[PDB]
Structures are given as C-alpha cells and as structure tokens.
Amino acid sequence: MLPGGPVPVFKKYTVGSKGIWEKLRVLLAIAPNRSTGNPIVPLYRVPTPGSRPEANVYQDPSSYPTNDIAENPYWKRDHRRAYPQTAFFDQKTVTGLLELGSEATPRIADGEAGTKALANIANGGVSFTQALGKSSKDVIYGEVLTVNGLPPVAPTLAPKQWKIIEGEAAIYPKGYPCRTFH
C-alpha cells in the first residue's frame, strides 16, 4: 500500500452495521471499505465544548524570549519601527551611480572636488545617456548587465523546481487528462 490508503472500516470513526447485516453489506457493497458517514455519538463532540475540563487549567500561551521579564527590551523586538524604507531612484540618482560608483565600488575623487562632482549630477549637469556612452566595458558589463554580458532576468524570491509524479503515486491513473506535480 501507499502512504495514502486504502484503509479499512474498523479504523474509520463512523456508525456502521453489526451482525449479519455487516456480512450482507460487505457482499452488496461496491467498495466495502466505505462508510455511512454518520459520526459515532459517544466520541464526536464529547465532552461538549461548554464542559471541557481543559478550560480551567488554560493559561495564555507565550514564547520564551518575549515572556522573559529581565533582558527583554522592546526596542530590540520592535519590528514595526524598523520597517524598510521605500527607496526611490530617479535618473539623476542612477547616473551618479554610473558616472561615479557606489560605496562598494567607488570611482569618486576625494575632497570638496568630489562633493561638487556629486553636485553637478544632483542638478542637470550630466545626463543619463551621456554617462551611458561614457561608460567603459567594465562599468556596463558588471554594473548594468552581467559579467558574461547577458541581461539579468526577473528575479524569484523563493524559486520552485518542479517535478512530475507518474504511475502509481499519481493522484489519477495514466489514462486521465490530468497529472500531478510535486
């Protein structure tokens, strides 16, 4: 058998038949495994929800480092005021990253010279197409495109490599026009 059945009747929690009527049912049933579907009164919904003993012992559940009373400041587990800013990049802020570079790969002059170099781009001093044409191969092939020269693809956060299940594990047999992917 598989991890998903079939299972007999004496493990299903339904009200069945008893005696000769069970022998007759297993004779006259397309699938004797199957149940009437009526729940078993002693078990289902017993004890009633308004008489559960477990409500007197119940206590509000918690997790340890948040219920810790001593070294549990809120300003460390304040994840709302740590929210990530909505970054905005107009063509000005992108040409500066092109003509100049970035904190990881600087290409900028030191001192007030480089400061006014930033200032020339903050205003309309140099344009995006001008610095796209003034960009050496190492700039584009490594900061706009890839090192291989190919453009990047629409990224996936959590990639999914699909797989097919066929034959016996599958939900439906081979003949049917539906299949099963893991």
Partner: protein, 191 residues
C-alpha cells in the same frame, strides 16, 4: 555550472513535461467487443445508480429543529444582552469602546453622572438591522457587560422591535444569565 540567457534552472521545463502521445484505436488493450458491451449496456451508469441506492438504505441526516436543535458553542454570537454584577448593579460604565470599534456603527450611547456620583448610561441602543454579529463589542468591553447570546430565535413582524434599547437589553441579560455564565466559564480563558 550552467549560464543562462533570459532563463533559469527553475523555468527550464520539467524532465517529463512532454506528454507521450494520444493513443489511437490501435494500441488499445481492450477488445472492441468489451468496450462495445460497456457502450451498449451502460456500465458506469448502472454503477452510479447502485451507489445511489446504497444511500437509500442509510441513515438520513435530518433533525427536527423545534424539538431538536443543532450544535451551539460558547463562542456563538447571536442576540445581544447587557449583564449585571451579582450585586444587582449593571456593569456598563460608558467607556464607549463598543461604540467606536463597531464596524456598522449600530451602537448609540449617551452617559452622564448618576445621582450617586458614578458613571453610567441613560441610553444604550443597538440597531440589529445594522449589526453584523462580529463580536468585537464583547471583546472590547473591559467589564464583560455587553455579550452576545447563543439565542437566534428573535424574529419579529416589525422593524421597530429590532431597535433595542437599554431596558430590552437589561431584561435580556436578566433572562439569559445562566446561559451566559456557562458560555463565559468555558470561553473566558481563551478570551
């Protein structure tokens, strides 16, 4: 290992994605007379009818409502009620949190200083034609005054019997207090 051009190892197709082929009448491992008999004697039809018949001999699910009611839980939300303390005093203090959180703005309150110097209500209304029975009002009250009973049998012939006032709610709470105590004793710890 591999370098991809406008693609990925995820978007690469599954190994067996290419379905094999449609089978023809040849390459049919079921003789023509067999499927002919199933075609002319309506096999799957008789099978479905027999699966229907087995239900004819099984226990019906029906219950007689006015003599046997269906399951009801302490968490259930029906008619409204205003409770009292065992002292006989009412619990409402006109914090007007029920009036603020209510999505439908059904509730309408007006308080003032009582003759004994306490905070209490002179008006508490509910338009049950505005109510959606959400239970946010039994959640906000910090004294467990307003509650929602399991009662659902309060239909009327008029729309003005549904504009409940304070007196209609205080009596409803005097009436259902035993049921409210059961539901509260088995709902409060989780609430």
């Amino acid at each position: 290992i591999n370098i991809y051009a406008g693609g990925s190892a995820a978007a690469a197709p599954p190994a067996g994605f290419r379905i094999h082929r449609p089978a023809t009448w040849e390459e049919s491992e079921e003789g023509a007379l067999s499927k002919a008999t199933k075609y002319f004697l309506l096999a799957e039809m008789f099978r479905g009818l027999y699966v229907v018949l087995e239900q004819f001999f099984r226990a019906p699910y029906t219950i007689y409502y006015p003599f046997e009611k269906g399951p009801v839980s302490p968490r259930f939300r029906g008619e409204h009620a205003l409770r009292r303390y065992p002292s006989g005093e009412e619990r409402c203090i006109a914090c007007k949190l029920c009036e603020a959180i209510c999505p439908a703005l059904a509730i309408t309150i007006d308080a003032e200083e009582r003759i004994d110097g306490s905070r209490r209500t002179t008006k508490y209304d509910i338009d049950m034609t505005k109510c959606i029975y959400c239970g946010y009002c039994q959640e906000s009250c910090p004294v467990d005054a307003i509650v929602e009973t399991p009662n659902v049998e309060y239909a009327t012939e008029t729309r003005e019997e549904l504009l409940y006032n304070k007196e209609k709610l205080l009596a409803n709470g005097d009436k259902w207090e035993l049921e409210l105590q059961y539901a509260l004793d088995a709902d409060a710890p989780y609430r």
